[PDB]
Design a protein around this ligand. Structure first.
Ligand SMILES: [Ca+2]
Lengths: 76, 151, 148
């Protein structure tokens, strides 16, 4: 936070609210970048599914909390 | 002092053609005459930036909104230095980036309230930056309106 | 024994009644059984449980399950439930319903407001004022405050 290195690190995080498979990939990339992410329950697809997974059938939830397309895709 | 913005940053052009209608969406009629799978950079020609400057929204506004057009493959260090020094934005004490498509122009009332109250109050107390899609729709619009209200 | 095992195989539907020392209160139990017996979330088959919850005062149950976020509640879906909650004085429930993505501006209509005012309780003071005076609400306010 300025003053070159004399300052201190500027915190950062990402807030997630619903999304789609592309949003899930974005979240995965960000996490692999070691940046905190926050999810909101009840937002919708791509956000509530991860919240439920953290709280915890998994395949059934993946199909339920997200639209039929890409649900069979085990890449999800 | 913007004589160097084109020097550092650059703009990207379709250049090569990858198929009536191509991947880049440019009509076949309007396409460079120089021209399998579209390439993000290999099938792209780099050119100096040309859309830098400030915006003054018609009607109500702050008469100052630094808008810059830059290539996707740009080092964040130069962008951060530009923002911090040239535009006079002080180093944030916090940065929050919002994510999610938020299908539907109108969002849930509970979700809108949660966002505008919690996130914006936290930013106000700490004096942070918020990064969202610069689009006047959905979550970006909600963040913008909440930030303006708290300002 | 085989019958008992078969019953256990589908225990998702069976629900016990907790006497709780003469509780004599199980609306919540009925709602819990109904919600746990559905599972699938399509937002078109959960309206009946919502209407039952409105008819009762089990707001907590509805929030826990019906509005846990799993189901995709639309806008027009909650119009009737909101109207019922307003007519029966369900404050917590109306707050919950409006919270979950209900557009008041697109909801309230002159007919709706007329019905809300017609919901006055029997020979109440407001009923007398309305009869003495479409909602026809401006005149009563001007009479009370003074219109000056
Ligand atoms: Ca049902």
């Amino acid at each position: 936070t300025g003053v070159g290195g004399t300052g201190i690190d500027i915190p950062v995080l990402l807030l997630l609210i619903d999304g789609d498979e592309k949003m899930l990939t974005r979240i995965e990339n960000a996490t692999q970048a070691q940046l905190p992410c926050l999810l909101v329950a009840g937002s919708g697809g791509a956000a509530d599914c991860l919240a439920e997974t953290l709280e915890d059938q998994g395949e059934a939830r993946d199909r339920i909390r997200r639209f039929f397309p890409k649900g069979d895709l085990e890449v999800l | 002092e913007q004589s160097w913005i084109p020097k550092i940053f650059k703009k990207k052009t379709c250049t090569t053609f990858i198929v009536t209608l191509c991947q880049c969406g440019r009509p076949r009629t309007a396409h460079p005459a120089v021209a399998t799978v579209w390439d993000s950079d290999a099938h792209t020609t780099e050119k100096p930036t040309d859309a830098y400057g400030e915006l003054d929204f018609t009607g109500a506004g702050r008469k100052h909104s630094n808008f810059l057009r830059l290539s996707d493959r740009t080092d964040p260090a130069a962008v951060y230095s530009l923002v911090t020094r040239t535009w006079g934005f002080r180093a944030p004490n916090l940065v929050v980036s919002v994510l999610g498509g938020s299908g539907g122009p109108v969002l849930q009332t509970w979700l809108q309230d949660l966002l505008r109250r919690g996130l914006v109050r936290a930013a106000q107390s700490t004096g942070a930056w918020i990064v969202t899609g610069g689009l006047h729709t959905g979550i970006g619009r909600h963040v913008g309106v909440a930030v303006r209200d708290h300002q | 024994q085989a019958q008992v095992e078969r019953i256990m195989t589908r225990k998702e539907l069976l629900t016990v009644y907790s006497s709780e020392d003469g509780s004599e209160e199980f609306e919540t139990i009925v709602l819990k059984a109904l919600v746990k017996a559905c599972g699938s979330s399509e937002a078109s088959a959960y309206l009946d449980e919502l209407r039952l919850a409105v008819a009762w005062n089990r707001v907590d149950i509805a929030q826990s399950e019906l509005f846990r976020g799993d189901i995709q509640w639309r806008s027009f879906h909650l119009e009737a439930s909101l109207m019922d909650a307003l007519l029966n004085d369900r404050p917590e429930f109306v707050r919950l319903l409006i919270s979950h993505g209900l557009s008041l501006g697109h909801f309230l209509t002159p007919m709706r407001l007329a019905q809300l005012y017609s919901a006055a309780p029997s020979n109440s003071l407001i009923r007398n004022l309305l009869d003495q005076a479409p909602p026809d609400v401006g005149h009563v306010l001007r009479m009370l405050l003074g219109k000056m």
